[PDB]
Amino acid sequence: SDFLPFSRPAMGAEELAAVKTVLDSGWITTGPKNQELEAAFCRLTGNQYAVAVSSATAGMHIALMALGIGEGDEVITPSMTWVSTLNMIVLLGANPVMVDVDRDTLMVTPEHIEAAITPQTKAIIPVHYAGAPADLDAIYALGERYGIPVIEDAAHATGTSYKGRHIGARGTAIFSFHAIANITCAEGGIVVTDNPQFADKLRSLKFHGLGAEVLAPGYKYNLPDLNAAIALAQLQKLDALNARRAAIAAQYHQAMADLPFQPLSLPSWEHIHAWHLFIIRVDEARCGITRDALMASLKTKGIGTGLHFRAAHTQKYYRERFPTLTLPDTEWNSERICSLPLFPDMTESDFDRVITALHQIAG
Amino acid sequence: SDFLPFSRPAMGAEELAAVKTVLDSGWITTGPKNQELEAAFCRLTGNQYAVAVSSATAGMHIALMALGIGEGDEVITPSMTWVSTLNMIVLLGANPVMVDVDRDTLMVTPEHIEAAITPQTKAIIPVHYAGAPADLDAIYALGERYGIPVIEDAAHATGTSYKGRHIGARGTAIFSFHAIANITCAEGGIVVTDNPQFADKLRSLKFHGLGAEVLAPGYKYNLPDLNAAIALAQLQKLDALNARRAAIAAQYHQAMADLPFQPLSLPSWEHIHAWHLFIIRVDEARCGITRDALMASLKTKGIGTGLHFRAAHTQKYYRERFPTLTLPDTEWNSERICSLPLFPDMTESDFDRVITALHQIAG
Numbered sequence: 001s002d003f004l005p006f007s008r009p010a011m012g013a014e015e016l017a018a019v020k021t022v023l024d025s026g027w028i029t030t031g032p033k034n035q036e037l038e039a040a041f042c043r044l045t046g047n048q049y050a051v052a053v054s055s056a057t058a059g060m061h062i063a064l065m066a067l068g069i070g071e072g073d074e075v076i077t078p079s080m081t082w083v084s085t086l087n088m089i090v091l092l093g094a095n096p097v098m099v100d101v102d103r104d105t106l107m108v109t110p111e112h113i114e115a116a117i118t119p120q121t122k123a124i125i126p127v128h129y130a131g132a133p134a135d136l137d138a139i140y141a142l143g144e145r146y147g148i149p150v151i152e153d154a155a156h157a158t159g160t161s162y163k164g165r166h167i168g169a170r171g172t173a174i175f176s177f178h179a180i181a182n183i184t185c186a187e188g189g190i191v192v193t194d195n196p197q198f199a200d201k202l203r204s205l206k207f208h209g210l211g212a213e214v215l216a217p218g219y220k221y222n223l224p225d226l227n228a229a230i231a232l233a234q235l236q237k238l239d240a241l242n243a244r245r246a247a248i249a250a251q252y253h254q255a256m257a258d259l260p261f262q263p264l265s266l267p268s269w270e271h272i273h274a275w276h277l278f279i280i281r282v283d284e285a286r287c288g289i290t291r292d293a294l295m296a297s298l299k300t301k302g303i304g305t306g307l308h309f310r311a312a313h314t315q316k317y318y319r320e321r322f323p324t325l326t327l328p329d330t331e332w333n334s335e336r337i338c339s340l341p342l343f344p345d346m347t348e349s350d351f352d353r354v355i356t357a358l359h360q361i362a363g
Numbered sequence: 364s365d366f367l368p369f370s371r372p373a374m375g376a377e378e379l380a381a382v383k384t385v386l387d388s389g390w391i392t393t394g395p396k397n398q399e400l401e402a403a404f405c406r407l408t409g410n411q412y413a414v415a416v417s418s419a420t421a422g423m424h425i426a427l428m429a430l431g432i433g434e435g436d437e438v439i440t441p442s443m444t445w446v447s448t449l450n451m452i453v454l455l456g457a458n459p460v461m462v463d464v465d466r467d468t469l470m471v472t473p474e475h476i477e478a479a480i481t482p483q484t485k486a487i488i489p490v491h492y493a494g495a496p497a498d499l500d501a502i503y504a505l506g507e508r509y510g511i512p513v514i515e516d517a518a519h520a521t522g523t524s525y526k527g528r529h530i531g532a533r534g535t536a537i538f539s540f541h542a543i544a545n546i547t548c549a550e551g552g553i554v555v556t557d558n559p560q561f562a563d564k565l566r567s568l569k570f571h572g573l574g575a576e577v578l579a580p581g582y583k584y585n586l587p588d589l590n591a592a593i594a595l596a597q598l599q600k601l602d603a604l605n606a607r608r609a610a611i612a613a614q615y616h617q618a619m620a621d622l623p624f625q626p627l628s629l630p631s632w633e634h635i636h637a638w639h640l641f642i643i644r645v646d647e648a649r650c651g652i653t654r655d656a657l658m659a660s661l662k663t664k665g666i667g668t669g670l671h672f673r674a675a676h677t678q679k680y681y682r683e684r685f686p687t688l689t690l691p692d693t694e695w696n697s698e699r700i701c702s703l704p705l706f707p708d709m710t711e712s713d714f715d716r717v718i719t720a721l722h723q724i725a726g
């Protein structure tokens with residue numbers, strides 16, 4: 001059979017149609033479809049303002065930039081995340097303060113966050129990992145208590161809910177429209193916020209810092225209507241798309257009961273899982289093989305897998321900048337985690353092909 | 364009749380088809396179509412390496428970043444240009460050194476460049492204005508003599524030639540795939556260079572600074588294959604598309620002989636005009652009306668126009684940062700220039716509608 005990648009975008013007739021209307025219109029860059037997408041995300045989350053951007057990385061950049069973060073400022077973040085967050089902190093001239101995460105949910109804890117707080121802390125950046133939400137009640141309380149803004153990394157959390165409310169409903173959250181995200185337009189993102197002054201700054205910084213004329217220099221991070229229209233078509237399918245992911249995640253849960261591999265633990269609080277990823281831990285002790293070996297073997301069997309992620313602080317630049325930094329739970333998982341196939345268009349043929357491969361390598 | 368904008372993208376069946384193959388493929392982000400586009404631009408220009416990016420602004424950012432430009436460093440650039448170049452210089456922490464341009468070609472002169480050179484100069488950034496090339500022989504000589512890298516702003520110059528050779532054939536040039544550019548994919552750009560070490564740095568800085576792992580923090584500026592495929596379809600039509608622009612520019616030249624308005628002067632050297640814009644000067648003295656009045660009147664007649672550009676140093680942030688800065692030729696034109704309709708799909712009905720409007724407001 002053909003290669004089974006660990007993810008595929010759910011592109012259909014709606015996506016192609018959306019593009020066609022934009023191309024035929026002549027207005028292919030930022031315009032009406034961007035306004036519609038922003039208005040739509042406000043309706044999805046329950047928030048008041050939304051700013052569409054070229055990527056969630058870009059969203060993180062202008063979000064932190066809008067806060068005036070720079071020299072001498074600290075930003076608390078997990079090491080277990082995508083390198084984008086760490087890079088934007090550094091490139092702004094600020095100091096990344098990496099903290100550890102829960103050993104089984106891979107989510108940053110209020111404990112580890114609070115212990116790292118200093119008068120130089122200008123932001124706390126939690127990650128709604130794999131689609132599951134973090135402990136926002138506790139983390140928000142830390143923010144209001146110490147007076148530190150909270151910028152939520154919701155790159156995995158489109159459709160995620162935390163204690164009855166959508167992620168992005170309150171505060172500030174940054175979603176991703178990357179190829180493998182729940183909804184996609186190849187590359188894109190959106191910042192949702194409740195602060196009108198903050199939103200105006202984002203809107204400015206994403207487009208040359210114009211109002212027109214330059215008021216304060218900004219970057220070019222605007223999302224074309226070409227892509228926005230695709231993200232809109234996807235957003236209409238969101239509940240359906242996530243339902244498929246959820247259904248498949250359930251089937252994984254069953255098969256894993258008779259497998260040595262350890263899926264992530266669900267958060268203890270009320271939530272709705274967007275199921276962007278299905279991560280398993282591969283401990284050589286109880287599995288008989290290393291995670292690297294498993295990924296190489298699955299590949300031989302024509303099955304793709306992901307690595308989300310190898311901790312940022314174990315990568316070259318951050319190894320050399322923070323030699324002393326130790327994060328045991330982060331490091332433990334980082335050496336053992338990998339992402340199994342999970343995408344809306346995945347079939348039972350595809351699913352059973354994975355489990356058959358997993359039993360074959362185990363034993 | 365309907366509104367006649369001053370530009371429209373030439374979207375056809377090829378563009379829609381290109382998108383469809385990408386969507387159907389499942390690989391919608393950076394991939395094969397990006398490689399093809401880079402290889403194609405190398406074939407167009409005659410250069411050896413090309414790096415596709417999310418925008419020409421983004422290209423300018425990583426280009427200057429790759430040079431190590433930062434605190435204390437100066438960058439010579441015209442004020443008569445798009446605010447993007449000035450913003451990227453500043454946001455890097457470097458100092459923009461704005462210099463004047465030729466009164467009739469709006470191109471930066473070797474004279475003004477050389478006079479502003481100092482041991483802090485780390486880059487010279489000429490602009491191939493409106494599609495016409497700058498005096499590269501002189502400017503390159505300045506670069507090699509003083510040991511200053513030259514980064515060419517070719518946002519208007521896709522298809523432009525200078526003394527028998529394509530723009531981008533040598534050194535470093537940054538092209539734009541913006542909506543109104545000669546070729547477009549809504550938003551996009553590409554850096555073409557002859558330096559292999561330099562190109563590797565760009566390739567890294569446009570994608571998180573990865574090789575993988577982070578070697579040195581970078582931004583997210585990668586172009587999706589979705590858009591790259593559109594840029595490829597356009598690139599195949601380039602000569603045809605520019606021929607239409609050129610043909611229309613010829614018709615403007617005729618009508619302007621019997622009009623008080625002053626088109627830009629052509630460069631004195633051998634060249635091929637890409638004709639991205641057709642700019643005219645509107646001097647209240649010999650025209651009877653101001654440029655602002657003309658644009659407002661043409662709009663009433665359902666005819667759109669452009670302003671490329673109001674000098675960067677007359678915009679708020681740069682007014683306050685450089686109060687003493689005076690650039691007479693830049694300022695003179697900046698108050699009098701505007702861009703008339705010019706796009707491949709423009710008809711004779713559209714053209715004659717402009718000239719009829721121009722004679723009506725003159726007299």
Ligand SMILES: Cc1ncc(COP(=O)(O)O)c(CN[C@H]2CO[C@H](OP(=O)(O)OP(=O)(O)OC[C@H]3O[C@@H](n4ccc(=O)[nH]c4=O)[C@H](O)[C@@H]3O)[C@H](O)[C@H]2O)c1O
Nearest residue numbers: 026027028029368370371372418419420445518539541542
């Ligand atoms: C010298 C130089 N250096 C760097 C850059 C930046 O490159 P980059 O942009 O790739 O990063 C540029 C690019 N600048 C261009 C891009 O940004 C600006 O363009 P813009 O914001 O759009 O607005 P306009 O000029 O006035 O054109 C808009 C019109 O156009 C019509 N229109 C507009 C959009 C659309 O989708 N369809 C359409 O018909 C439509 O008719 C619309 O009215 C500049 O004016 C343009 O000149 C540059 O000229």
Ligand SMILES: Cc1ncc(COP(=O)(O)O)c(CN[C@H]2CO[C@H](OP(=O)(O)OP(=O)(O)OC[C@H]3O[C@@H](n4ccc(=O)[nH]c4=O)[C@H](O)[C@@H]3O)[C@H](O)[C@H]2O)c1O
Nearest residue numbers: 005007008009055056057082155176178179389390391392
């Ligand atoms: C917590 C957090 N914060 C911020 C961000 C950044 O957001 P932003 O990206 O919007 O700026 C992210 C996003 N990170 C994602 C984007 O970048 C990385 O993705 P990636 O570079 O692609 O590679 P992979 O993960 O391994 O997936 C690739 C696979 O996927 C398959 N594939 C790939 C492309 C495609 O077009 N089609 C396809 O089937 C195809 O099967 C391919 O093999 C991360 O791993 C992804 O997790 C994040 O997770």
